[PDB]
Each structure stands twice: as C-alpha cells, then as structure tokens.
Write a protein that binds this DNA or RNA. Structure first.
Ligand SMILES: [Zn+2]
Ligand SMILES: [Zn+2]
Lengths: 640, 640
RNA sequence: UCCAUGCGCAUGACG
RNA sequence: CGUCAUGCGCAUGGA
RNA sequence: UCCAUGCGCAUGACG
RNA sequence: CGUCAUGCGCAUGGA
C-alpha cells in the first residue's frame, strides 16, 4: 500500500503512538492515509502479539457504507476481519461480540455510545475503550460540544486523569488507546479574533486529547496540482397586510413589531401560550391564524404568491373539513369572522396571484446561465417547501425544457416541518441519476452541501442563504474566518509543548467538571413521579378532556385513554391511522391500531395541563418534560 | 417401564397435571419420557375412571410413522388402543370416530386442524379439544407464529379465557386438557439481546400456555456421558457480462446495481411487471432473458460454468422448439436479435467452458479428507440443481471412484423450482442405502439437517450456507445465539410465578386480538365475486385471449376455456398431458384429459388481466388473488 | 408404486 | 410489503 | 422497499 | 433561555 509523500509526512507522527489530528483539504484521499495508519498499527501489534483493534467512527451511515465498499475492505480483504456496522443495517450478532471478533470495525458513534451506556447500566452488554487499541474519528470538527464524539471522548479524558492519579500514587494504570483525528477543516465557531479562534482550536484538541495538529507545509506543490465569485441580480402583499391589520383591530392586539419577521411570529407564539393560560378565545385561535399569515408573508417575500395561496387554501380547506365533521354527529363567532374574512377575498386574491418577484429575476439569471454549457447544476435554499415550489414552477416554464434543463428536488429524511420527507433510497437514486445525467439540476436545502457525493458541478447557486453564484457579504466573512482559522492553526502548531499540555489539561478539567454539574442538575430535574395529579383540557375550548389516572401507556412511548367515557367526546377524520379531533375542531391525536387494539393515541402539544394544586396552566410540547409517570397498560383489563 | 433419573425429574411436574414444556438434547430419548407420561396419565384416569385420551402431534409424517413403529405401540401394545394416523396413509374410518375410539392417537397437526374447522363449518364432522384429556407436541419451537401448532393452541387459549370469565361470573366451566411440550431446543429468533430472547421464550410459553420450562441442571453427569471446527479453503464471466451490457444498451435499461445479486433479479422482475402493464416488447422478453442470464451468473459463481451452459442450452433449445412449432400450422426482431446474439457465441462459450472455481478447490479438500477413513460423509448446499451438478461431476471424476467414494443426491419432494422432485419412498431408500453403506457420501439441501435419521457421520461439509467443515463466521453467531438462549432459559426458569403468569396472560391476549384483526381483514378482503368483468391477454403479445364469461371451472381447482373460438388460437407441444403455447410462443398451459374431456387448462401466471373498468393491467400469479368467481362447468352442455 | 394439479406454512438471503 | 432459494404439510385427480 | 411514532444532537437566522 | 428553519443520528412498531 503505497503512500503519497505529503500524506506520508503527516502520517509519520501517528506511527509512533502519538494521538494527533490530521486535517487535509477535500480530495486528498485522507481515507487511504487512515487505512495506512490502521495497517501499520495492526502490523506493529502483530509483531508485539497484542490486541489490535480499531473503531472507526463516522457521523453518517452513508460514510460507513462508503468506507466499507471502497477504501477499508478492498485494501484489507485479505489480512484482517472487517465489518461495516450501522444502525440501519440489520445484523445478527450483538456489538460486544463484534468487539470480541472483527479486528477492524467501521461503525457509527451512537452505537458505541449505546453499548458503553449499557455497560454503565444493567443490560449486561459490556464494552470499554480499553478493549480497543486505536480510535479513528472522521469530521472531528463536530467534537466541540456535548455531541456524540465529545460524549465518547469525555469518558476517555476522565479515565486518563484517573490513570495519571493512579500512576503517581499507584503502580498499575488502566491502558488507554491511541486516538487519531481526521477532518477537512478544524473550523472556527463564534470567533471574532485570533484569540477566540485559537481558544476554539485548543478546545477541540483538548476534547480529542490531541498532541499536535498536522498539516502539509512542505509538499504543497503536488497538493495544489491535484486540488483546485459572487454574482447578484406587491399589491397582494399590502392587501394581505390590510387583512392582518383588520384582524388585529378585531383582537385589540399590539404587535410591537413589523410584519414579515421572526419577531412577530415569536410574539404570536407567546400570546398563544398566554391565551392557553387564560382559556380564552380570539387570542389563541387568532394567534394561530396570524402565525399562518406571517408564514405566508415570509414565503411570499421569496416565493411566488401562488404558493402562499396554496398554503392558505390547504389550511382553510382543512378547517372547513374539521368544522363539517364537527357538524356531523355550529360555528363560533371567531371562526365565522375569520373564515368569512378569508373566503370573501380568496377569489380576488387568486386573481391578483397570476399578476407578475425574486423568482422571475432568478429565472432570468439561470436561463442566461444555461446557454454556456455535459451540463451540471446545483441550487441551495432554506425551506423544504421552497424546493418543491421551485421544481414545479420550473417544470411549468417551457424555456427550461426547451434548453433541456431537467431539475429535481432534494431534501432530508427528518419527520418534521409538516412536509413529505425524502427517504435515503430516494436520495441515493436521485444522486445516481444526477451522476448519470437524467437530471441536469438539483435543488437541495443542505444535504448536497456535505456528505452527498456531488461533484463536477459547474454552477452552484445560493438563493437566500466551478462558477459560484449568490442570488438575493457572507462570502467575505467566510473568507475572513477561513484566513483566521489558518493563522490560528499556524500559531498553535508553533507552540511550546509544555504550555500546550497545561492549556489542554485545564480545558479537559473544565469540560469534565461542567459535565459533572450537568449530571447533578439532570438528576435534580425529575423529583415528583406522581401517578395522577393533573387534568388535560382542550387548549381552544377550555373543557375537561382527560384525568390523570385514566391515561395508560403502550411501548413506554405512546399515551392513550382507554376509558369508554372519553370515547364519547372526540371525532374521527381521514382524507387522502385515522386522526382524532375535538368537538370544537381542535386536533387531538391519531388512532393507532396496535396489538389488536384500536387505541386513540393523543399528543400533548395540543392540550393544556391543570394541576390538582391549582397551579397555572402549562404547555410542554413533549411528555418527557413533566416528571410525573403514568402506568403501563395491562391487556388483561379491557380484554373482554 | 423404567425411567431414567434425569428424565424422571423433568417428567415429575407433568405427573401432577401441570402443562409444561420439556426440552432435552437430542439422543436423550425424550420419546420414552412422553410414553411414560402418557401411561401414567392414562392410569390416573383409569383410577378416576374418566375419559383418557392423548393426541400426539408431529409436524412430519415420518415422525408419526417412526413413533408408531418404535416407541409408542411396542410399549403399549397390550393395555391401550393406538393408531398411527397420517394424511398419506389411507384409512377406512373418519377422524371423529377415531376420537370416539383409539384411546391413544399419533397424528399430524393439520388433520386435527381440518377436523376442528369442519366442526366450525357445516360438514358435521365434529371434534373438540374438550374430548381429549392431554395433548403432546413435538418440536414446540415451531409454535411461534400462525403455523399449525399455534393455530390449534390459539383456540385453546381463547377457550381458557372464556372459562376464566365463566368461573368468575358463573358456576360451570368447560373442561380443558393438559398440554405437554417437547423440543430439542426452544430456539431463539430475530434476537440481538437477552431481552429479545427472553421475550421470544415468553411468547413460546404463552402460545403453549406452559407453566414453566424444565431442563436437567442436577443430573448432567450421565447426560454428558451419553451425549457427546470451521475449515475453509473467469474469462467466461466477463464474456457473458459483455453480452449483458450489450443487451442493456439494446434495451436502454439502467440496472442501478451490479450483476450477480438478488437486486438485479428483483429489478428485472419489476421491469417485467411494468412491461406487462405497458403491453410492449423488448422489455418483458428481455426481462426474462436477463433473469436467465443473472441466474446463470449466480450458479457459475458457485458451480462449474458447464452447468450454466446446460441451463442456457435447455432454455434456448426450448425457445427454438417453441418458434418451430409456431412456424408450423415468423420471428420477431427482438427474438431474432437475442437468439442470434446467443448462438453466435455458444460454440466458443463451450470452448471456454472446459478451461479450468470453488468446485476444484472443494475437490482438492474432499479428496484429501477421504484419505483418513466404515466411512461416512455428508454435504450441504442450497439449490436442488447444485446437488445434481455435484453428483454428476463427482461421478465424472475418477479419483473419487478410485478411493471408493460413492455419492448420491438428495432433495425434498416439493413440486417447485422447475426441478425433478424426490419422492418419500426414494428418500427412504437412499437413507437405507446410506445406513447399509451402498453410498458413502450424501448431497442434501436441507432434508438431512433434521427429520432424516442420519447419524454416525464423521464428516459434515457445508458448501455455501464428528468433524465439521464449512467451505466458501456464521458458526460464531450460531454459538452466540445458543449461549444467549441458554441464559434466557436460565433466567425464565428463575422468575416469580405471578409475574410469569401476568406476562403470559398479556401475550395470550395480544395473540388473540391480533388473530381477531386478521379475521376481520380477511373477511374484508374479498368483496366483489363477479361472474365476468375481465379479459385475459397474452403478456408477451398484448392480444385478446379470453373473455370473463367463456371460462369455466372443474374440481373448483382448474380453469378451462371450452369455447371452440378459443381453440383456433393456441398451439400444442410435447417432448420427452401436452403443453399449450401461444401463437407468439408464449406458454399458456396444459392439456388435461379429465372425465373424458380434453380440457385446455391454462395458468394465470403467464397472462395479463384487463378489467372492463379500464383499470390498469395486473399480474397475480394465482387465481385466488382476485375475489371474482367463475361458474362451474356443466357437462350437459358440450356433451354432444 | 408413479404422475399431474391446487392451497397453506416455516426457514435463510436480499430489497 | 416484494423477490429468490430451500424444506414441510394438507386436499383433489389419474395410471 | 414503504409507512407511523418517540428521543437525542448540531448548524443558521431572530428575540 | 425562547422561536423558526435546516440537516443528522439512534430506538420502537407495522405493511
Ligand atoms: Zn376543543
Ligand atoms: Zn402471445
């Protein structure tokens, strides 16, 4: 396994047992450097005939799969055992056994963290860093806070301090493994001065217990040989603002801010909370409606107003369906007022919609851009909805199709934001098409920025964040941060070893003590653990919905209300298991058909709590917030 | 009937009316334990002078025959009545009468299940678990899902819950029988942790309504006295891959995966389905051809390429015969292209075939192995075709004959996979020869693994799955699973009785409610039951083949088309009742000469459906999938 | 004893 | 939920 | 392969 | 400390 010279120089310190960091520009193939380090370390242990283990940690499963497929296994098919562990891949043997075998391991951090926790717990599945003899970490820049990498390494730091104390006062010391570190760039965060950036670098080193940073400052020639611009370009709004002012007058609400900013939205949420604490109308409901209107304004500021019309149409059609279902099996004055205030203008609002806008300007830019050019293209943005809007809008246009510009959307897989997520398989398929060429342009929020193997891209356009385009100053600050980070690395590399040791030791002690106080506060957090001390009410209509003892739990994850008395209250809806709404139209939850039972599961976000101590109402957004515990459902009862 | 001490201890709880499980290592003769339990129970009932019945259930007919021949009858020839019931043995008296007589019964589960269903139905042949006073089950580990054992025992669980309700609210309770359970090992399935294995064990106990598990933890000495290693060792491929790439280019097909994996085959099947939904060529036909090529690649990866040549030769010779028959009484461009692309290389492909391979390596291993050694040998594999290939190939070699190694193939009897099945009689004969010694080595897929009485085997080789050999990590996971299962049993045995009762009760309720939802969904499945609403077309050539009313049914099992108009379409073929093919060469079905009528029976796999509602085309693979029903043939019509 | 057909079930691998 | 392989069981019919 | 749920983490903007 | 957006990871369950 031949190694490049610039790679060779940086790798040399690690071959001597030094736990260091190794940061190289993207495209330099530092993965092969890690493979060489691994092979050399395992050969050294073979010569010494000792436990040779490596645990490669990557924050994304895609990276573990790629490393198994391309770099580690092919180069080590013959000598050693390898396994591409991950959480999504179903294995048949537990993790401790994988440690007892499979000399070389590619995994994901939180799996190892879970195994360590189980060791600390009573699950009896044990594993310790002492078992491993070397640890390799990818994207070390994420080891800056209580993330998984730092959570793993803090245990190692604590054990190292205990080992120092034992050494000084005792003969035996628990062995600890070597620690390698890889990263495209150490990064700088919340830095305004060289001093702050240097403090950040020292913090990263202390978290990784590194000895020194390593870069290539002598063989830059072939590196530059292998590794190789900012361009910048209504009546519907005021009509909607008029409606907003009218509803404010109807509600006697003082915004204190303008329309189309996070300040107004935050105030709306705060007033919604207050209204829920008062059990009053025209405040909570109007708070939600103003939230929706402000969202419409914000999207219109960057997206065609047709999409704001679609958003409002979906919202009010859902409201109509809710009220119609309520009528089955009357309407409040507030609901009547708001719905009539909307519907009376919906048709004319749409009429305004078609009238011609950052969108048209961006179109004018990109159509001109595509005349130059194989062709490739990328677009960045913020919201998931914006991606769908741009995709369908560019599909509607005929000029792009005439040029042959085929575009497709791309987003993450998180189940949030009330948008259809994209699965990992679909992301893989889309990227494969992009490589093949079935799609000429990509629209991504942040996925294509890192992780996804997107390359040979001529155009990269950022819309509201190798030609580079930024449609809408941030590039200047980004370049300044890059330069400051490089200078900080240069300084830190050139430092007295003892001063560096003292500083990193102080930082390690600080981190450990902070974690100790975090543990103390977390333990002190939950203290009540009461069976039934509350009552749940509908936040819109301050009516009794549930008691504290009639609730039960399934899977220790879902909370349900089995009592027949409760079932006479809610209503069911479904369109395209089923959704559960109030008598007032407020959503309550979902009908889960689990274990041969039709459990009406409910969510806490949409209810309000009333303690038996008459304490003020509260909103939680999550069950775990309160410390009181509920009993687990017993199927013997209700079996019937 | 003397009983061994370790057997005595485990059997003791059952003598007190406890429904338990009894798992002992193979070779400990737990059958005699069951016989002792049966004799004691029947003697106890004789003393009480009540209905003494036992229904022994075994999942294989061979086991029932062996129990009748060796263990139950010989030990109970004198006192009680016994009968070796099975589905293959022709009896003269129905099953309910056998219950009314024949105190002790050895049978197979699905026979009892059929009788219970008839009781539930209107056939008037009745039988109930209340009739029996004891139930004995062999290989209880199969009672984990909706298999026959669990399907029988769920009725018992439901009846037990009804009995508890009656007891609490009423005086009388329907009697229920004792339940014994035998198994070599409870087994662990889909378990990665002690918790999951324990959950599996509890599920098995709930399905069997066991009181406790029982093992021998005190008399292990004589058990170990009576009851008593992993070894591990081209241009044709690329030539065929070149042809595959060429045909892909001819078809504009994007595989998205590599060659020689189930992914490519699954994609080929999906694209075949899509093509059938489009009624287009070069997609379905090429899908089948690529299926065959991928199968050839997979078998070549583990088998000599000569067998891949044989497979392709059979396929293309059958195609030539089909096209020649079509010419009797033209060829498509796609068929011409593919057949010419194959034949032009067949001779040179064979020339490559003889050029020297897991096969030669395995030969080198086994020839060396046979120098040690009465001699015995076993080989395991996956495919039925691999067994025939290995048998004929080892026959071709002269070294094995020189050593005196005689080998024979062995497979199951299922009528699937397009391979010649092996009959039960032939399996018995082969095993008898193996015991006698006419054959020194056996080649089996999975039959010899369990059920078949194969023993005193020095060598057991697994090729792509008391010396043990594994030619090609799974042994490690198997040992881990064994250890985890043993620990789970140890834990479950040592548990509070009331907690165990509560957990098993919850599991029983869960299983019953799940079955209730299954029944609901099955009832809701079929709703249409229409006489004629579809048309059948040939999937290759999207041409009308049959209407919905011209079809008729015989035996409520076969669907035929009596209309003369249909007969003018198809063609007949036969080589070595007859087979029916299309005008395009597509296979349609078989000519069944039944009840003095030459019915042209057809299969649904090879046709495509077109609803009268213009719904999209569909593929079913089975008639029962659609709910619409067809009329039964009336012989008065067509009698002529 | 052999042959043909239909239905159901479980295991393993893969997606 | 789908694909492949393997094994098993039951129910019909014929020689 | 798809769907639902829960939990945790980081980044950016804002207050 | 709170709000919004984005992305990621893990753990359950079902088809
Ligand atoms: Zn309400
Ligand atoms: Zn045809």
């Amino acid at each position: 396994l031949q190694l490049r010279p610039y790679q060779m120089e940086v790798a040399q310190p690690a071959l001597d047992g030094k736990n260091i960091i190794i940061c190289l520009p993207t495209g330099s193939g530092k993965t092969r450097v890690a493979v060489y380090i691994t092979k050399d370390h395992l050969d050294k242990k073979k010569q010494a005939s000792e436990s040779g283990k490596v645990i490669v940690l990557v924050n994304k499963v895609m990276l573990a799969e790629q490393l198994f497929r391309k770099e580690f296994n092919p180069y080590l098919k013959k000598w050693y055992r390898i396994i591409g562990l991950s959480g999504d891949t179903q294995l048949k043997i537990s993790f401790p056994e994988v440690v007892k075998s499979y000399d070389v391991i590619i995994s994901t951090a939180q799996i190892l963290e879970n195994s360590l926790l189980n060791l600390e717990s009573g699950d009896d599945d044990g594993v310790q860093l002492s078992d491993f003899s070397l640890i390799i970490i990818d994207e070390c820049h994420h080891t800056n806070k209580e993330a998984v990498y730092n959570n793993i390494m803090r245990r190692y730091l604590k054990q190292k301090l205990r080992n120092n104390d034992l050494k000084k006062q005792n003969k035996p010391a628990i062995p600890l493994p070597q620690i390698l570190g890889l990263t495209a760039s150490p990064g700088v965060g919340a830095a305004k001065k060289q001093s702050e950036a240097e403090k950040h670098i020292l913090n990263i080193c202390a978290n990784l217990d590194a000895f020194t940073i390593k870069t290539v400052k002598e063989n830059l020639g072939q590196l530059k040989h292998q590794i190789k611009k900012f361009v910048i370009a209504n009546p519907f709004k005021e009509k909607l603002l008029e409606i907003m002012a009218s509803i404010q007058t109807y509600c006697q609400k003082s915004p204190m801010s303008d329309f189309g900013t996070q300040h107004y939205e935050q105030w709306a949420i705060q007033m919604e909370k207050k209204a829920a604490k008062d059990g009053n109308r025209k405040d909570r409901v109007c708070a939600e409606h103003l939230r929706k209107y402000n969202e419409a304004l914000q999207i219109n500021d960057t997206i065609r107003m047709i999409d704001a019309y679609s958003h409002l149409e979906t919202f009010y059609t859902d409201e109509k369906e809710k009220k119609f279902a309520v009528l089955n099996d009357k309407l409040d004055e507030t609901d009547e007022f708001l719905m009539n205030l909307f519907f009376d203008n919906k048709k004319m609002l749409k009429k305004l919609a078609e009238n011609p806008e950052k969108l048209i300007k961006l179109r004018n830019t990109i159509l001109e851009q595509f005349t130059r050019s194989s062709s490739r293209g990328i677009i960045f943005t913020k919201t998931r909805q914006s991606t769908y809007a741009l995709s369908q809008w560019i599909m509607e246009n005929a000029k792009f199709a005439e040029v042959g510009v085929k575009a497709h959307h791309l987003i993450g897989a998180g189940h949030s934001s009330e948008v259809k997520p994209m699965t990992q398989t679909e992301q893989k398929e889309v990227i494969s098409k992009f490589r093949t060429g079935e799609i000429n342009l990509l629209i991504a929020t942040t996925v294509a920025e890192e992780g996804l193997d997107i390359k040979e891209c001529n155009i990269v356009i950022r819309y509201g964040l190798s030609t580079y385009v930024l449609v809408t100053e941030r590039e200047i600050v980004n370049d300044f941060r890059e330069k400051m980070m490089y200078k900080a690395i240069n300084r830190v590399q050139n430092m007295k070893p003892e001063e560096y040791a003292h500083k990193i030791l102080e930082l390690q002690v600080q981190s450990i003590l902070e974690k100790k106080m975090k543990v103390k506060r977390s333990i002190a957090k939950q203290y009540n653990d009461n069976p039934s001390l509350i009552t749940l009410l509908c936040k819109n209509c301050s009516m009794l919905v549930c008691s504290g003892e009639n609730i039960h739990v399934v899977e220790k994850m879902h909370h349900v209300n089995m009592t027949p008395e409760f079932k006479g209250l809610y209503i069911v809806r479904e369109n395209k298991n089923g959704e559960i709404i109030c008598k007032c139209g407020q959503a309550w939850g979902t009908m889960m058909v689990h274990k041969g039972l039709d459990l009406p599961c409910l969510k806490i976000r949409n209810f309000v709590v009333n303690f038996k101590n008459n304490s003020p109402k509260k909103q939680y957004k999550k069950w775990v917030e309160l410390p009181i515990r509920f009993p687990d459902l017993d199927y013997s009862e209700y079996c019937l």
